[PDB]
Design a protein around this ligand. Sequence first.
Ligand SMILES: Cc1cc2nc3c(=O)[nH]c(=O)nc-3n(C[C@H](O)[C@H](O)[C@H](O)COP(=O)(O)O)c2cc1C
Ligand SMILES: Cc1cc2nc3c(=O)[nH]c(=O)nc-3n(C[C@H](O)[C@H](O)[C@H](O)COP(=O)(O)O)c2cc1C
Ligand SMILES: [Cl-]
Lengths: 122, 122
Amino acid sequence: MLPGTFFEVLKNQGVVAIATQGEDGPHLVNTWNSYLKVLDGNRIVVPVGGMHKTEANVARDERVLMTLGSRKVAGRNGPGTGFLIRGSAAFRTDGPEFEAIARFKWARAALVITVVSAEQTL
Amino acid sequence: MLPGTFFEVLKNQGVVAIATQGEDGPHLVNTWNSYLKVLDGNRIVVPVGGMHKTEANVARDERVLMTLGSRKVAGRNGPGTGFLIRGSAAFRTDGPEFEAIARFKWARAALVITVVSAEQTL
Ligand SMILES: Cc1cc2nc3c(=O)[nH]c(=O)nc-3n(C[C@H](O)[C@H](O)[C@H](O)COP(=O)(O)O)c2cc1C
Ligand SMILES: Cc1cc2nc3c(=O)[nH]c(=O)nc-3n(C[C@H](O)[C@H](O)[C@H](O)COP(=O)(O)O)c2cc1C
Ligand SMILES: [Cl-]
């Protein structure tokens, strides 16, 4: 699901954005490109410190959107690229998906996104 | 209302994320930190090339969320910071707000976000 160009983006610094559906509208939170931990089976894991509203939204609708990119990776027509990722989210407080990000001692949980599509949008 | 730290973030490159309300969950698109043009009266202007789905969503619900940040600007507790912006969106195709981003020759419109709140979230 995730292409080589996406892993090239992860070699670079940047702000990741994660959109969820709440009752009254969307919500949008962040992590860092360098915090994402990618596992076998199309999983992207995010260390969770806050994300309380995000977690409440995921209870309502597990489908999330994620974007990220880097000016330092070539897109189709010039320097810079990024991705729109769609997948389903789950929060883990133990087990190997949590252990994947447990080095971040501030993390109360792991946000595990199982990717269904990844589109290079530039 | 946009604070000095937000302008410091804009001096550095990054991926901006813009969330809208779709008919079956959120939608999420991007621009670059360096593409934003900030005008008086709390207006952030984004050059629009694509964003057809985003635009359709805004026509139904003008409320948007925007995030952006930079590893290179100090947050409250370490290097790196970013912002959650909440505001209302409009798409302009003539006049001063369109002219503000018209140097981008690929632009079909200007996405004008009138900021209601800005939160430094790190
Ligand atoms: C650049 C950036 C990186 C962030 N990294 C994380 C992170 O890795 N984990 C996290 O829980 N919150 C992180 N935050 C804060 C979240 O975006 C969010 O504000 C916080 O978790 C509260 O989430 P909620 O609004 O869903 O309750 C980061 C914020 C910024 C601006
Ligand atoms: C880092 C990055 C920057 C982008 N900059 C713009 C931009 O300035 N204007 C634009 O219309 N689309 C830009 N795009 C593409 C949009 O994110 C989006 O994929 C495209 O406009 C289609 O929008 P829609 O899904 O609302 O139809 C950028 C994409 C990335 C990854
Ligand atoms: Cl990073």
